[PDB]
Each structure stands twice: as C-alpha cells, then as structure tokens.
Design an enzyme around this catalytic site. Structure first.
Site, PDB file in Angstrom:
ATOM      1  N   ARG A 202       0.862  -1.130   0.171  1.00 26.58           N
ATOM      2  CA  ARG A 202      -0.066  -0.021  -0.010  1.00 26.58           C
ATOM      3  C   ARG A 202       0.836   1.251  -0.029  1.00 26.58           C
ATOM      4  O   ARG A 202       0.527   2.100  -0.421  1.00 26.58           O
ATOM      5  CB  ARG A 202      -0.798  -0.083   1.207  1.00 26.58           C
ATOM      6  CG  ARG A 202      -1.853  -1.134   1.306  1.00 26.58           C
ATOM      7  CD  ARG A 202      -2.678  -1.044   2.422  1.00 26.58           C
ATOM      8  NE  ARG A 202      -3.816  -1.791   2.763  1.00 26.58           N
ATOM      9  CZ  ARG A 202      -3.692  -3.230   3.335  1.00 26.58           C
ATOM     10  NH1 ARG A 202      -2.472  -3.574   3.607  1.00 26.58           N
ATOM     11  NH2 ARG A 202      -4.707  -3.969   3.614  1.00 26.58           N
TER      12      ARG A 202
HETATM   13  N1  LIG Z   1      -4.639   7.564  -8.723  1.00 27.87           N
HETATM   14  C1  LIG Z   1      -3.558   7.008  -8.221  1.00 27.87           C
HETATM   15  N2  LIG Z   1      -2.450   7.144  -8.819  1.00 27.87           N
HETATM   16  C2  LIG Z   1      -1.086   6.588  -8.102  1.00 27.87           C
HETATM   17  N3  LIG Z   1      -1.486   5.758  -7.354  1.00 27.87           N
HETATM   18  C3  LIG Z   1      -2.359   5.018  -6.774  1.00 27.87           C
HETATM   19  C4  LIG Z   1      -3.687   5.984  -7.376  1.00 27.87           C
HETATM   20  N4  LIG Z   1      -4.893   5.282  -6.559  1.00 27.87           N
HETATM   21  C5  LIG Z   1      -4.127   4.160  -5.940  1.00 27.87           C
HETATM   22  N5  LIG Z   1      -2.749   4.218  -6.128  1.00 27.87           N
HETATM   23  C6  LIG Z   1      -1.862   3.403  -4.982  1.00 27.87           C
HETATM   24  O1  LIG Z   1      -2.743   2.217  -4.836  1.00 27.87           O
HETATM   25  C7  LIG Z   1      -2.887   2.133  -3.215  1.00 27.87           C
HETATM   26  C8  LIG Z   1      -4.196   1.678  -2.959  1.00 27.87           C
HETATM   27  O2  LIG Z   1      -4.296   1.304  -1.480  1.00 27.87           O
HETATM   28  P1  LIG Z   1      -5.631   1.507  -0.849  1.00 27.87           P
HETATM   29  O3  LIG Z   1      -6.597   1.293  -1.428  1.00 27.87           O
HETATM   30  O4  LIG Z   1      -5.342   3.121  -0.221  1.00 27.87           O
HETATM   31  O5  LIG Z   1      -5.309   0.846   0.478  1.00 27.87           O
HETATM   32  P2  LIG Z   1      -6.538   0.577   1.752  1.00 27.87           P
HETATM   33  O6  LIG Z   1      -7.677   0.575   1.187  1.00 27.87           O
HETATM   34  O7  LIG Z   1      -5.806  -0.777   2.570  1.00 27.87           O
HETATM   35  O8  LIG Z   1      -5.950   1.761   2.476  1.00 27.87           O
HETATM   36  C9  LIG Z   1      -2.457   3.504  -2.851  1.00 27.87           C
HETATM   37  O9  LIG Z   1      -2.073   3.579  -1.556  1.00 27.87           O
HETATM   38  C10 LIG Z   1      -1.489   3.856  -3.886  1.00 27.87           C
HETATM   39  O10 LIG Z   1      -0.162   3.555  -3.612  1.00 27.87           O
END
Ligand SMILES: Nc1ncnc2c1ncn2[C@@H]1O[C@H](COP(=O)(O)OP(=O)(O)O)[C@@H](O)[C@H]1O
Ligand SMILES: Nc1ncnc2c1ncn2[C@@H]1O[C@H](COP(=O)(O)OP(=O)(O)OP(=O)(O)O)[C@@H](O)[C@H]1O
Ligand SMILES: Nc1ncnc2c1ncn2[C@@H]1O[C@H](COP(=O)(O)OP(=O)(O)OP(=O)(O)O)[C@@H](O)[C@H]1O
Ligand SMILES: [Mg+2]
Ligand SMILES: [Mg+2]
Ligand SMILES: [Mg+2]
Lengths: 470, 476, 471
Positions: free
Chosen positions: B340
C-alpha cells in the site's frame, strides 16, 4: 451506589453492583483511580454492559486495556449509554469512541448537550422514499452505477484496490459540490492511514465542514465495535436539527463484523458458520437501518468492504449484500492494469438505472456501454490465439471502441496529487453522458488510445493528444 | 495480604489463594525462586503462568508479590550479543552493563505524532526492491509454506544494512537452538553481527518465554528509535507465538473460538504490530520497520491467524513452494503480493523503471496463465511471452549476495528498455554476472550521481554504457 | 506418613491421596505392592508416574502397566526420584523394559550399578556445535537429493505401509557395521514381531555386543509407550558424555509418544485442541526433541520415523515436528503403488546439508536440476490428460521423457529386501550416483527401455538389463 470489580479476563470484566441499582444493557461505566502506593498504577478506563448474570453480578467489556486493574476497584455508573457530544462544535475535530478529541486543538466543554449512541430506529410512519440521482463527479459511478440519496451504497474489493483513494475523492468532490455535513468513521483503521487522511484534508482545506471519528486496530475489540455507532449519532443530530443531506462514510465494516465475533467469543457464546457469532444479521441490521431518508432529509452512506479471498459467500459480505441499494465491485486486475478507480463495468449493479429514476438517454447510453464491454470480454482469447486480423470488421469496430471506453472510464484525481502530483478535476453528469455519446458515435475514433487515460472531458482528450500532436 | 499459597502446579501453570491486591500482568515470585506472570484474576483463585522450570514447585508452597511490573533491560551494551527475552546473556562472553530498563507493555504513538513514509529500506533483493517496495516505518508480512525462504530473506536484509544506518534486531521464537547457532555464525562470517542484537527463545523453553519474545524485542528496538536512529525488528515466526498463547489459554480454562484460538489473538497481535511507527521531526525523525513471518499449512489461506495478520499489515509478500521448486529464487508471486505504501518509498530513478515493470509483468502473468498451453500464438503475444520469460530469469538471484540499488536500477532499466532481446534466456544469469563487473570497471560516475542524488543519469550516457558492455559480452 | 491410597481409577489414569506434607514432585515414580489377601483378588506389581497435582493433597498419575485389579483404599509407596535407569558399561548387549529391568533371559543387572534420572534439562546454546558434514549412507536418493548429516537429526515421514522400517533396517545394515560407536535402539509403538526379527538380525551379525536396546510395544498401555523414548535417550546421553564416543540413536516410531499423550490427556482433564490433541503438544514434544543434541563433548546422530496420522501432513503432530529435523525424508503412498521403492518424494525432501559449501558445486547443480525436471513433469501431467501427449512439443516432450526415467532410476534394491523378494542388493557410492543422474539428464542413454531403470544400482546394471531385453 458504586460497583466493585470482581473478575478480569483480558477485555472482559465483572462488576458486582449492589442490587436495586443495576445498570441496563449497553449502559456505560467509569473507572478513575489514583495509586495509593508505589507498586500500583493509575487508571482511567470505561466499560460497557453486555449481559446480566445470576446474582448482582454484571458482565462488562472494556474500552481501554485492563492492565493494572486490581480486584475490588470502585466502578462509577453513569446511568446512561455512552454519550457523544453533538453540535456544530465537532466540525473539523477528531474524536475517540467516547467523544474526547484525539487531536491537540482543544477540549470540548462539559456544558454542552451529548446524545446517546444507542437509540431505536426510524418508524414505519416517519420513513419516506424520495429518489434523486447523487452527482458524485466520478465518471464510472455517475455513468454505470448511479448513486442515490437516502440509501446505503457499497464498495466491495480485496486488499489494495483503491477503496481509500476513492473514499477520499468522494469526500473532496462532495465538499466542493455542497456544504452538506460529512462524518467520517475510521472503524478499526490502521493508525498510519489516520495520519495520511487527517493531513491530506487539512492541507487541501476540506476539513472546515466535516468531522472525524477514529478507533485504531490496537484498540480492544469492543472499542472497535462501538466506533461506527458514534459516527451514526453525530450524523443523526445534523439531519434532525439542520434538516439537510449529511453523508456518513465508514472506512471498512469487515473489521466491525470481526470485532463482534471476538466479543461474542469473549462473552462465551457458541460460534456458527465460519466462526461468526450467532447474532450476525441482528447487529449489522441494527447499524444499517438507521441510514435512511426520513422527512427531514437524508443520511446517505458510502461504505467499503474487504472480501477475504475473492469468494463472496463468506457471512460478512453475504449478510451485508441484502441491505445495500447499489454496489460497485473493485477488482485488483484492473488496478494493476493502472486504470482507476478500479471498478468493474460488468459486475457493478444499481437500482437507479431505470428511465423513471435516472432518465431515458442515460438508460440507453449505459446499456450500450455494458453490451460493448461484455462483447469485448468474450473476444480477447480469440484475439490472443487466433490472428487478430481474423476478427470480422464489425467485431473489429467493437474492439476499437471497447479499448477507448475501457480507458476513458479512468479519471484524473485530486487524491492522485499525493501519489503522482497531477491536478485532476470534477465532471458534472451531463458531460459524462454526452462524452460517452461522443465515444459511441465514433468520429473521434482517430484519436489514440493512450490519450484517454486520466482525463475529465473529451476536450481534455483532444488536449493530451495535442501535446502528442495528434 | 500479599503472600499466597499455591493449590495447583500442573502442566506449566499454577493457581493460587490469597494475593488480594494483585494486578493483571504483575510479577509474583515463588519460593523456589522463579517468578510468574499473573494473567487471570478470577473470583477466588489467581491464575499464575510460570516462567522457567516448573518441576520443583509443589502445592502448599508460598508466593510473594514482587510489586514490580514486567520490564526489559536496554542499552548500547546489548549490540553484538545473543540474549534471552528476560534479558540474560546466553552466549558466553559474560554479563552486559544495561544502563536502564523499559516496560514490556506500553502505549504506542498517537495519530498526530507520526509522519508519512518517504525514505526507502533497500534490501538488495531485486524482485522486492523493484516490485514490492519497503519504506522505513512500514510493516510487512512475509507468508509462505515451510522451506520456501523466510529466514534467508531476513538474513539478506540484516546483511545489507551495513551500508545504510540501521540498528537491526532479530528475534527467534521456538527455534531449534542449533539452527539459531548456524544463523549467528552466518551473520558473524558475513561480518554483520556487531551492529545487531539477536534474541533467542528455543523450543525447549517454557511456554510464556515463547509468548513474551516479540514484546521484549520491540521494547529493545523502540529505545533506539526514541534516540533517533533507524531500527529494524524481525520476528522469525509469529504463528509459534500464537500457538504458545493457545496452549497457555486452554490450560487456564478460557472460552475458546475458531480452531481453538482464544478470542484475544487479534488484539494481542495488534498490541505488538502498532508500536511500529515513523515519528515526526518534533519527536526525532526515527523509524521502527517490522518484518513478521507466518508459516501457512499447505498453501492454506482464509485461516484465522493468516487473515488476522493480513488485515493488520500494510502489505504482504506471498512465497510459493511450486515456484521455488521451479527455479525462481527467492520465489515471490507478484500476482498476490501488494504494498500500500509502494511508489512513495522508492528513489525517483527506481520509481520510473519499477512502475513500468509492474505493468509488464502483470500483463504477461495473465497471458501466460492461459495461452502457454497452446504451441503457437499471435506474434504480439509471442513477444509479450518472451519479455515475461526474460523478466523472471533476470529477477533470479543467488544466496547471501545483496546487490546495491545503483546496479539494480541499471539492470532493470536494461530489461524494460529492451536491450536483452538479442541474448538467450539461459545466458542471462551470466549477462548479469559479467555486466556488474563491467559496471565497476567502467561507469563509476553514473553510480555516484545515483548514490546521493537518487536520480537517473542522462539517457545518452546510460545507453552508451550498456552498448559498450554488449560489445564485450560473449553469447553462447 | 509416606504411604498413600488410591481413591479413583479411570483406566490408564489413577488418583492417589497422600497425607499432607509428603506430596511427590512431578515426574517422580510410585510403587504398588499388594498381598492378594482373599480368594476374590488378583495380585499385582505396578508402578505409577505423577503427572499433575490437583489440590487437597490429590495427585493424578499414569500407570505403567495395566490397571486391571486396583481397589479403592489400596496402598501406594514413593520411590523418591524419577523412573531410574541403570546405566554404564554393563548395559551393552542387554534388552530392557521401560522401567530398567532386563527381559533378555541372560540375567539381572548387578545392584551396584549407578542408576540415573530420565528427566533433566536440555543442553544450552554455548554447548552446541554446527560443524556439518555428510553421513554418507549409500541409499541412492538420500545420497543425491537430501544428504544426511553426521551429528544431525534425521527424519523419516510416512503413512502406514509405505516403507519406513525397511529403510531403517537398510540404514542399520549400511551404517551400524562401520560407525564404530555405541548404538541405542529404542522401540516406541513397535510391533513385537519386528523386535524379535531385529534381535535375531543383530545376533546373526554379531552387532549386539556394542549396542543396547529398550522396548515398548503396541500392546502396552500408553504411559509405558511414552516413557520408553526417554529411557532409551538417557542411555545414549551417558555414552556420548562420559565415554565421548560418537553415538547412534534409533527411535522406532516417535509419533506414538504424542498419540499416547493424546489418549491420557483427556482423562487427565484438559480441553481438546485443533483435532482432539492435548493442549501441550509442541512444548512437551519440543522438550524431548531438544535433548537429542550433538554438543562439543561428543556427537549424536539420531534417525527417527514419524507416522503421519493419515495421508495428511497438515495434522498438528507432524506439523510441530517438521521444524526440529535437519534432514527430512517424505515417503508417499502414491509412488509406492507404482512400485518405486523406497517411495521417496523428490520434491518435498529437505536437508540443511544441501549447500554448495557442504556438498560442492558438482553435486548441488544436480540436486536442483533434477528437482526442476520433476516439478515441470507435474505441470505437464494435467495438460496431457486434456490434450494428449501428441500436442506437447520441444521442452515439454523431453521433460516427460526424462522424468519417467529419473523417477524409476531413484529406485534401488535394498540388501534387506532379499527376504521379501528373491533379489540381491547393492551399495552405491556418491560419485556413481552423481555421475549417473548427470548421465540421465544429459541423455546419453535415452534409447534404453524405461522398464530397465527399475530397482537397479548403477547405469552399468541398466545397460546389462537392456541388453538382455534386446537392445
Ligand atoms: N490515482 C492513483 N495514482 C497513483 N497511485 C494510486 C492511485 N490510486 C491508488 N494508488 C496506489 O494504490 C494504493 C491503494 O491502496 P488503498 O486502497 O489506499 O489501501 P487501503 O484501502 O487498504 O487503505 C494507494 O496507496 C497508492 O499506492
Ligand atoms: N535465494 C536463494 N537461492 C537459492 N536457494 C535458496 C535461496 N534462499 C534460500 N535458499 C535455499 O533455501 C533452503 C532453506 O531455506 P531457509 O534456510 O530460508 O529456510 P526457510 O525456507 O526459511 O524455512 P524455515 O523458516 O523453517 O527456516 C536451502 O536449500 C537454501 O539454499
Ligand atoms: N526397498 C524395498 N524393496 C521392496 N519392498 C519394499 C521396500 N521397502 C518397503 N517394501 C515393502 O513395502 C512394505 C514396507 O513394510 P514396512 O515394514 O516398511 O511398513 P511400515 O511403513 O514400516 O509400517 P509402519 O509405519 O506401521 O511401521 C512391505 O510390503 C515391504 O515388502
Ligand atoms: Mg483501508
Ligand atoms: Mg525459520
Ligand atoms: Mg515398523
């Protein structure tokens, strides 16, 4: 009339109140103690009552760790449920389960009114059934699974698919669209994400008309369970007195179901199914039914769910699925493909995609889009293993437009500012539906597929290609 | 009063009468001289888990109350030694002058106190440092079947920390004590043992010492983080800790749950795993990254301990036995492993090359999963199958030979930009070998810019370097 | 008053009620001497081991021989110490019951002999050693894929009927003749037939002079089965400490120690775990296994077998004991039914001794490349079941081709097999093994019929078989 502690077994405690003065179930209890000698430890702890026992004794659950609890400590009885401060004062602040502010900004005065966490749900007379499409400004949600006010909405996925990124983009777009109150509950949330989100909302300046409740994973299970209801009692004050649409966000309810399972096992009940407690549907219904659209206004809610192993028959998802009005499924394969927020067009469903609710054109547009993507999903393996020139020119047309459609459901995002830095933007419904009418008409089929990723308008797609010079 | 009589002594547990003013988690001392951790304060008898050998204790004996609560010795003196969780030396070499003590159980840092995770924890393992990045303050599970590569990856981490400051720790729970000795001598032979502490609880030890081992290890790690130096803690198997809790709770007559694990397990692990942090500049800028390991039974998943830990940790690495016996080492499935925090932790040069590498390998993972069985496919797919096969062969690595980040980015860049098409799949592990030597014979300025800038060098000069090496290297 | 009374019986378990102030410690031993006083009763001599206290002066005890006959109010004496084994020079060539009395008809042990406790704490971290080298043993697969370790724990894992005891008997036939050290053989959960067959095997080869032996049997009550493992180990411990010779220990089936614990634990009064096992599985099994260690003073090599309760390795008792063993052999039923013996799982055999430092580069490359071909063959077996053999090509055709031959050439005629089958046995040097598997992987002998590679010693013998079949 103060109780005395008589057993400790980790989170669970037992208190022997003098009879004639026993608390109700779901009542709240205070321990405040200062150590008489060097060996002892000072404690400030609250308990909730969870069932009665054979004589005088009451069986209770603890909201802070029970380390240092002597036997024969005094317990104060509040005579009431856990009481959460409610008002406009909570806008901008961050609270624990018991209503104290976690952030160092300040302390709420004793003089204010506080509302109980536990209250009977909306009655049959009072309920109403208005229908309005909620313009979220998210190009997949607005096109292919239109959200509606008054109702429970659901986001289902595995781990690391975009659930929190998407919930942040919701909170930001709604704060731009309306000065409608939002309440955010991090139920059993990792203490790391709490720092990320508190600083993102402070730094974009989105926090002036929002409140936040947290209970971390390192909290006892009972404190993880009661954090969602605190968020409910806050959103309920804003609907009943201010009479305006007040969104409630819950970060993931899977942890909430598991906190209930662990509390039941500590109370000594017998498991069922894959070990979930007996009272699974009851507790979850009790929560979910307060989210409504009575005559004053609304408490529409958007919730996210972790699906343990891509099998959806596990009790917590399966019990949740009946209550939710509209559900969008997030799949990791698309997220790793780098098209976001990763939502599957074929597997997403809503009640609101009917011409009487959404609109005539919107119905014809959405069904053309889903038929186009379904025909692409059954054509890829022939494309992979026969020669791609063997596909008929009509199917070749469906291929070319399905490529563009699949990319142009991606969108540039304000929450990407942290991860990648780009600005992003907001799209009203009319421009989503018209742009897809432009995609399906095909005059723009000359513009290259790479442009369509991370854009908010077809004019942006013309600009990105323009940089490439097309 | 505060002296009591024992009325059971079975099985590694006791019960006692009296001790009115007792507290949960207090220490109480037996007449034999070993002491116990009070853990159920029931209505008329205190449950008392016993540390050390229990065979001497008999009913009718007396327990006195120490009045103290559980504390660990901490100092700079421990670095370079092998030590017992209660704090005693077990290695020879004599006593250790620990200046002060910290509590075993205490509150973690609040939400405000932390900062975002922005500096890397370079491991030297090409498939992790590229595709599943770790940043300082991150908590990440490694979960796999037995004999897949949990401890070898841990040791490669501790060995690579010579070049960047890290007061690393390593905690061994339940282990065969001769395996611990083979590990310690491996850390000594690779010249790496003088900046690290090793904590040992062997399989022979009584149940509570297996249970308390990670709590005392982290209590040692956090002192150095409060001073402001980066820290790393490794728990060699959390599942054996969970099993010690089960057996301890069942003997105490506590209502059981799924499997038979007591219902407290998720809270017990969250109390362990949420002390890891990255404190703010107001608090000193430290870190405490943690690497817990879980051994899954036969590729089991959706079980109670793995789902608990997989919900707590901010990422997970899944190792596959059928990958290992197919030649990929260390075997890491890119399909089911997620971080993450990923993207932010990497150096900017790595962020550009590792982001595209994830896309390439995901696209071929699906295309190969179905289309490999048929002999002949579409040209564009035969190309993507070739790029994926070279990608996995170029990500194979040797044992206890960490590769510095400077030469990782230059091999991944050579892979993604497609300089390796001419070279056959079998010869690649030799293309790497002969290239890294060439890269220390020529190209030192490239590495120097990457070392401090964290930045990819000018693409003209990088291509000039790789093209010259491709003049030197001889194809089979 | 140090005499007690039985108050309750419940099968293997008995509950004594000593008077106050004389409760025995845990693991002490107690004696039953009872005059058959009246025409109804049965005389017995029985000894009890204390296993818990239970308050109000009660202690719960495991009987070491069948409890048929015991009465409420019958007396119990206290020995004062653990079950005491007589050890020293005179033990060699003798056979004992679990209690330390000889059963071999030769005589009884002199009363002047020093006798020792069975329960004592394990060796510490400073005392161990890790100088690791090959216990070269001539069993073709174990000499290739999972080389056994001199001074290290070795494990045999298999279901009932797969071939563990035949492998132990080949190991005794190969090692125990040349080792030059005291051997202790302990039977835990042992067939009485195999015990007699071994005693005659050891006399016929003269090997019995150096070794000593302890037996319990399948027909024994569970307490005896548990405490045979500890009585055998105490002998091996004295010889490696005081005499300093290298020692060889064999335990016939160590699973029956944990199973006997599973039987007697529920009566003792403690809740089930993950599949009916006692709570204290891993602590007590680890307590026994952590004593069996090669300190600096003198090495032990110990070869054990473990019966997996069914053909399921995910069971708790196999799962806890997979950690403790340096080199493990997995015997699987599916291969045995094909007729490949010994039925050794090539993919799941793990040993620390595999490492380019310990075996050398020539031997390492071959262990891994052979495991690589057999793992690819498992993948091809599925797709050929759908499409057929005719659809595979290139690297998939030659894997099925070479994986058949390799799978057969890991089978060998044991020198102990000559009683089950008319055949003569073999001994194969490590060099002939590593050259042989190299030659099969190169493909020099690919033309020979796959029938020929079964139950054979060296590639020259395979050429001789293939010549008689008309090559
Ligand atoms: N629009 C985006 N651009 C770049 N990276 C992204 C984007 N959306 C998600 N990510 C990456 O994917 C991850 C998704 O994790 P997330 O859904 O936040 O985990 P959780 O739901 O367990 O908190 C983000 O932390 C980031 O690293
Ligand atoms: N990168 C690697 N390349 C080749 N072999 C490796 C590699 N890493 C580990 N191994 C092999 O792994 C085997 C042992 O694995 P390891 O020592 O890591 O135990 P493990 O898989 O962690 O299991 P456990 O946790 O029980 O120790 C040895 O054969 C060793 O050579
Ligand atoms: N190397 C071998 N050559 C020929 N036959 C063999 C070989 N090994 C085992 N067998 C055969 O397979 C069986 C092995 O019998 P064995 O005594 O080993 O059973 P086991 O696995 O020891 O049973 P248990 O686990 O109950 O002790 C017998 O039928 C024996 O003839
Ligand atoms: Mg989350
Ligand atoms: Mg290990
Ligand atoms: Mg046998």
């Amino acid at each position: 009339t103060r109780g005395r502690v008589i057993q400790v077994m980790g989170p669970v405690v037992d208190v022997k109140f003098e009879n004639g003065h026993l608390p109700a179930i779901y009542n709240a209890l205070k321990i405040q103690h200062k150590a008489r000698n060097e060996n002892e430890v000072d404690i400030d702890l609250t308990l909730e009552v969870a069932l009665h026992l054979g004589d005088d004794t009451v069986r209770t659950i603890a909201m802070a760790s029970t380390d240092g609890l002597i036997r024969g400590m005094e317990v104060i009885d509040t005579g009431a449920p856990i009481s959460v401060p409610v008002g406009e004062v909570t806008l901008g602040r961050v609270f624990n389960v018991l209503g104290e502010p976690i952030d160092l900004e300040g302390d709420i005065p004793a003089d204010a009114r506080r509302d109980p966490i536990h209250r009977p749900a909306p009655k049959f007379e009072e309920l109403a059934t208005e229908v309005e499409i909620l313009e979220t400004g998210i190009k997949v949600v607005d096109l292919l699974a239109p959200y509606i006010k008054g109702g429970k909405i659901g986001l289902f996925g595995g781990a690391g698919v975009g659930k929190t990124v998407l919930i942040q983009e919701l909170i930001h777009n709604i704060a731009q669209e309306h000065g409608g109150i939002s309440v955010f509950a991090g139920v059993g949330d990792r203490t790391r994400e709490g720092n990320d989100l508190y600083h993102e909302m402070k730094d974009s300046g989105v926090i002036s008309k929002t409140a936040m409740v947290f209970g971390q994973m390192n909290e006892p299970p009972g404190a993880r369970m009661r954090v969602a209801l605190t968020g409910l009692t806050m959103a309920e004050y804003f609907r009943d007195e201010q009479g305006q649409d007040v969104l409630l966000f819950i970060d993931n309810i899977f942890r909430f179901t598991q906190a209930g399972s662990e509390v039941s096992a500590l109370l000594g009940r017998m498991p069922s199914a894959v070990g979930y407690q007996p009272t699974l549907a009851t507790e979850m219904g009790q929560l979910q039914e307060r989210i409504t659209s009575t005559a004053k206004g609304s408490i529409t809610s958007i919730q996210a769910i972790y699906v343990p192993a891509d099998d959806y028959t596990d009790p917590a998802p399966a019990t949740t699925f009946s209550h939710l009005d509209a559900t969008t499924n997030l799949e990791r394969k698309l997220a790793e493909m780098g098209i976001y927020p990763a939502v599957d067009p074929l597997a997403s469903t809503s009640r609101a995609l009917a011409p009487e609710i959404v609109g005539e054109e919107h119905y014809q547009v959405a069904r053309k889009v889903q038929q186009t993507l379904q025909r692409y999903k059954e054509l890829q393996d022939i494309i992979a293993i026969l020669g791609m020139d063997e596909l008929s020119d009509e199917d070749k047309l469906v291929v070319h437009r399905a490529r563009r459609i699949q990319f142009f459901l991606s969108q540039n995002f304000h929450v990407a500012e942290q991860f990648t830095g780009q600005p992003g933007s907001y799209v009203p419904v009319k421009e989503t539906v018209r742009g897809f009418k432009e995609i399906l008409e095909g005059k723009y089929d000359h513009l290259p597929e790479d442009a369509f990723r991370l854009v908010g308008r077809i004019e942006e797609v013309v600009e990105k290609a323009k940089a490439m010079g097309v | 009063s505060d002296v009591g009589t024992v009325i059971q002594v079975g099985d590694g547990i006791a019960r006692a009468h009296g001790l009115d003013n007792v507290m949960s988690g207090e220490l109480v001392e037996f007449a034999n001289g070993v002491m116990g951790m009070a853990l159920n304060l029931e209505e008329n008898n205190v449950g008392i888990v016993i540390l050390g050998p229990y065979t001497g204790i008999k009913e009718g004996d007396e327990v006195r109350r120490t009045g103290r609560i559980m504390e660990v010795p901490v100092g700079e003196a421990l670095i370079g030694r092998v030590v017992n969780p209660l704090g005693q030396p077990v290695d020879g070499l004599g006593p250790v002058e620990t200046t002060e003590t910290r509590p075993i159980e205490s509150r973690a840092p609040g939400v405000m106190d932390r900062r975002s995770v922005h500096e890397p924890l370079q491991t030297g393992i090409k498939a992790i440092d590229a595709l599943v990045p770790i940043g300082r303050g991150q908590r990440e599970l490694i979960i796999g079947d037995r004999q897949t590569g949990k401890t070898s990856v841990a040791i490669d981490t501790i060995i690579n920390q010579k070049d960047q400051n890290m007061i690393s720790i390593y905690v061994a729970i339940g282990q065969k004590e001769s395996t611990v000795r083979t590990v310690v001598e491996t850390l000594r032979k690779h010249g790496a043992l003088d900046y690290t502490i090793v904590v040992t609880a062997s399989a022979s030890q009584p149940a509570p010492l297996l249970f308390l081992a990670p709590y005392a290890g982290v209590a040692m790690g956090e002192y150095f983080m409060y001073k402001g130096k980066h820290v790393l803690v490794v728990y060699d198997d959390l599942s054996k800790q969970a099993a010690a809790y089960r057996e301890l709770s069942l003997l105490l007559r506590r209502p059981p749950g799924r499997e038979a694990y007591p219902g407290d397990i998720f809270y017990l692990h969250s109390r362990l795993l949420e002390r890891a942090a990255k404190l703010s500049d107001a608090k000193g800028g430290g870190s405490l990254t943690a690497l817990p390991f879980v051994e899954t039974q036969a590729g089991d998943i959706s079980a109670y301990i793995p789902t608990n830990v997989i919900s707590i940790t901010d990422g997970q690495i899944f190792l596959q036995s059928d990958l290992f016996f197919s030649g990929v080492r260390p075997a890491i499935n890119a399909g089911l492993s997620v971080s993450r925090v990923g993207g932010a932790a990497q150096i900017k040069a790595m962020k550009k090359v590792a982001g595209t590498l994830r896309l390439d390998l995901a696209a071929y993972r699906e295309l190969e999963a179905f289309a490999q069985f048929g002999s002949d496919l579409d040209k564009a797919t035969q190309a993507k199958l070739a790029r994926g096969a070279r990608t996995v062969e170029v990500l194979k690595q040797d044992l206890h030979q960490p590769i510095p980040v400077e030469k990782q980015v230059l091999i991944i860049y050579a892979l993604t930009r497609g300089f390796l098409d001419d070279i056959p799949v079998e010869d690649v592990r030799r293309f790497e070998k002969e290239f890294y030597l060439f890269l220390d014979q020529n190209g030192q300025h490239l590495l120097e810019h990457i070392r401090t800038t964290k930045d990819l060098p000018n693409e003209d000069d990088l291509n000039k370097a790789i093209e010259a090496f491709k003049k030197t290297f001889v194809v089979s």
